[PDB]
């Protein structure tokens, strides 16, 4: 008959976004908090979304000073500006889970959760090696030139080593639909036979698909994207042979981090350390599991 | 009353005492927690005294309990590999704990403790609490890859500290062998400022030797993995035990909790989770105190 005991308050600081990968992440964060409000009513949650680093820092300082958080789940807007702030959170005795982007100094956080970039590459590459015979021709769209893009591409390249697959070219589409369209338009102009495309990303794949359709070559090649936009997952689930498979890189990694942080507060389960969430092959057979009709991603 | 969404099987080595007995306790304790939190799950737990028996428990689980997921701590790597492959091939989620299979890529999720982590956190403590010129002795485990990992990381974390390592000898993660190694250390070295016992059972045997020699006041001891009696003394400020380093038998709990999340939510839980070793101090020790555990 007494008031509900609260065992702690989880703060969640993430980049604000209404569309794209980060939009889907915002959605999964909000969805997880709603699930956990029901499962663990002894927890409270604060969610602050920030359009730049300065505002995340101020959000975090306010969360500590006035909202008495006892755990922080932070996806750093940028590594360096968030490092002393998050060290101050740790100094105050607050649990810290870092998601996605590391801080500039090591060993601050209690728990680090992120996706698997070498994994993503390798799963994609294994799919190509297992479905294309020697001498088939592909093109690759890369992301923004980055360490992360390098990890995916190196793992993919290692996985098709010795398959005899001919990689006609690789160009950067910058995880952007329009750059991707432009790159694919050029690939189509230049290469009269292309058997498959590693678009490596779902936004990039939509751009690639339109360039292919304007070229009237939709039937000629399949396309592997990445990260699981609902509209692509929808089509894979419905057996669209232009999209025979995909690879996850879950924006719901944020849900993983929040769930684990809740376990820390409500149980004695060990959840410190490093969790690299695996990338998974999506096929028509398992696609429904990955369909979030309410997601803006 | 609750509709069931699926059954989780758990296959672990049997033990009523030691580290693995603590692990059995945590498995049961988590299952009990989850019967309250997620009544939509069922659980079947089976423990084995040898690899051959774990194989048959797992075939049987699949054959007659209709499990949706398996949490397995393999008894030995090689004999468990094909049977666990067969589980994955029947469409059942697989979480492997602690000991890997002999081929990569089978499990959906791998959960284990951090052996480099354990030695570095210990070594960091030594470096931060001992001045240049202080002298230690080290007890190692059984000659193993895992012991090599801990010792390499400890050594690395104390480099440049000036700590003299008087000797290091294998105590085989056993009380009696540790007693014998420490008796010898005490015979040879007239002043020892600290002992990296590196395991709580080894710590207990070392402390008996030190007490026999009348040198309890002389040196502090760091163990490992968090036996309740040691945790109790750290919480209570015993100056002989100023800190410890976790390497959790409750890793099994992390593995079961995550596997539960796979069946009750859309939370992504595949991949690789290396559970971090933490420093235990008097200030935090009560959180690692489990009075009902046999460990």
UniProtKB/TrEMBL annotation, chain B:
Keywords: Signal. SUPFAM superfamilies: Periplasmic binding protein-like I. It is found in: Cell envelope. It comes from the Bacteria. The keyword Signal applies. One of its GO terms (cellular component) is cell envelope. InterPro entries: Peripla_BP_I (IPR028082), SBP_2_dom (IPR025997), TAT_signal (IPR006311), TAT_signal_bac_arc (IPR019546). GO terms for molecular function: carbohydrate binding. This is Transcriptional regulators-like protein. It comes from Cereibacter sphaeroides (strain ATCC 17025 / ATH 2.4.3) (Rhodobacter sphaeroides).
